[PDB]
């Protein structure tokens, strides 16, 4: 196909030699889902600005307002290094010698009487 032969070149440019045949079919299904939610929001933004033609600033708005919600990322390095030094300053606690099975408080564990219904 046309758009499915370009999908095998996006993977081969990323060095993906081996892949399942259903991999191309659902990256096209995601790419179709992504462009019919940019352009669906683009004509919502065009009707907000009251213009009959969806021009390039509408797609510039609908991309950056969908990328502000959908595609997130891990936390940044200046945020990870601040919560590290706030946590790594606290000294390590000592251990009670014969406390038993060392566990968190019981509202943080998964150890409850764990009931079930009576069969009748």
């Amino acid at each position: 196909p046309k758009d499915a032969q370009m999908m095998a070149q996006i993977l081969k440019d990323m060095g993906i030699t081996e892949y399942e045949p259903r991999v191309i079919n659902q990256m096209l299904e995601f790419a179709f889902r992504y462009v019919t939610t940019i352009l669906d929001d683009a004509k919502i933004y065009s009707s907000h600005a009251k213009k009959a033609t969806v021009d390039a600033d509408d797609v510039r708005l609908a991309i950056q307002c969908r990328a502000d919600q959908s595609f997130t990322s891990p936390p940044p390095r200046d945020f990870l290094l601040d919560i590290a030094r706030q946590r790594n300053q606290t000294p390590l606690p000592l251990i009670k010698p014969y406390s038993g099975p060392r566990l968190p408080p019981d509202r943080y564990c998964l150890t409850a009487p764990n009931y079930r219904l009576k069969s009748l």
Binding site: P1, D3, L28, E29, F32, T36, R116, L117, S119
Partner: protein, 90 residues
């Protein structure tokens, strides 16, 4: 306790989806088969969801019965807030 009574009746009930298949997709998400009746209620809830979508789609087909087309699933899931996608790339 209407639902507690129903789950107690769910022993001796065989659902449309098997418990070897409903229990497979529950084990995939961490839900382990402690009680068969609970697996059966989950199976029946999934069945009701698919059946309700299908019946709405049939009312749309009768308005425009017989064949279920993507243009029947499209207005049927639109009241659910679900925008279904055409394939369009095959």
């Amino acid at each position: 306790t209407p639902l507690v009574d129903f789950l107690m009746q769910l022993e001796d009930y065989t659902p449309t989806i098997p418990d070897a298949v409903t229990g497979y997709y529950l084990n995939r998400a961490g839900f382990e088969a402690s009680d068969p009746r609970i697996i059966r209620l989950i199976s029946l809830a999934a069945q009701k969801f698919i059946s309700d979508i299908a019946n709405d789609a049939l009312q749309h087909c009768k308005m425009k019965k017989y064949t279920l087309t993507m243009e029947d699933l499209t207005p049927a899931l639109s009241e659910y807030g679900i925008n279904v996608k055409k394939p369009h790339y095959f």
